[PDB]
């Protein structure tokens, strides 16, 4: 089974009103499990399963590391600003790190940064080098070639990352592997009969889902408009697909919902 650990960092000059200028959120298999920001100045648990399987030593440790990370990213904003000839203004540094244990058992590792929403640097484990995407990242690559950073990250991506990912998956095996069935609703709108048909799946877990419309059995997908998959507050997911039909063709259309919690695909009509 595919498992992922992601650490997602945003440092910003203009957050803004009432909001923190630095946030770090950790995810396990897409589920938010740790959180830090520059107002709390505390690394904090976000699922019940991580809270139960960690003591204060772990959160004291993560707090110091992320507090130092915050300071590193304060410096980062100032340094990149100079390299880009910028003054003041609205700017962001983004850092993504983590690992995947794939179904075939293989490990993948990520370490990448973006400046003002554009690729800045990426680690290339194959070649074992930091790639600079723009000239403004070449001095960073220089820094990593000298400081002996590359080996310290190999350790992280190939050992620490994966070992803890395996732990975390273990801590919340039941939570991560759970199934929540969607409540599905079909709704039709506009004119004489029944023009636009809506299919909404509410509150499903896990995230993957295929919702499609069938006109007399035929998948009209190049025709379907989808919202993609969006989150609810409680950790479940949401999705809507619409399709345009001639008024009074309502009876011809069927919504098909494929999801891991449904042993047979679910089939819904307009009332």
């Amino acid at each position: 089974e595919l498992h992922t650990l992601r650490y997602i960092r945003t440092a910003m000059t203009d957050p803004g009103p009432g909001l923190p200028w630095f946030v770090d959120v950790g995810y396990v298999d897409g589920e938010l499990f740790m959180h830090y920001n520059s107002t709390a100045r505390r690394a904090v648990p976000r699922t019940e399963w991580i809270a139960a399987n960690t003591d204060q030593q772990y959160w004291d440790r993560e707090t110091q590391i992320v507090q130092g990370s915050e300071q590193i990213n304060r410096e980062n904003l100032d340094i990149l600003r100079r390299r880009y000839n910028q003054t003041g203004g609205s700017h962001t540094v983004q850092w993504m790190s983590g690992c995947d244990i794939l179904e075939d058992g293989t490990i993948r590792g990520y370490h990448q940064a973006a400046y003002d929403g554009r690729d800045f640097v990426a680690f290339d484990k194959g070649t074992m080098t930091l790639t600079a995407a723009v000239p403004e990242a070449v001095p960073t690559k220089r820094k990593w070639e000298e400081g002996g950073y590359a080996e310290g990250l190999k350790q992280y991506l190939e050992e620490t990352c994966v070992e803890w990912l395996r732990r975390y998956v273990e801590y919340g095996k039941a939570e991560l592997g759970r199934r929540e069935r969607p409540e599905v609703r079909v709704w039709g709108k506009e004119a004489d009969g029944i023009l636009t048909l809506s299919c909404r799946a509410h509150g499903f877990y896990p995230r993957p889902i295929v919702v499609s419309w069938l006109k007399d059995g035929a998948v009209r997908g190049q025709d379907a408009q989808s919202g993609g998959i969006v989150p609810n507050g409680d950790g479940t997911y949401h999705t809507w697909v619409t399709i345009d039909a001639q008024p009074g063709d309502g009876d011809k259309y069927q919504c098909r919902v494929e999801h891991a919690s449904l042993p047979q695909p679910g089939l819904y009509s307009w009332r």
Binding site: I65, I72, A113
Partner: peptide, 10 residues
């Protein structure tokens, strides 16, 4: 766990 801070320095 997260990584050593230094590894986020540009």
């Amino acid at each position: 766990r997260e990584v050593d801070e230094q590894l986020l320095s540009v």
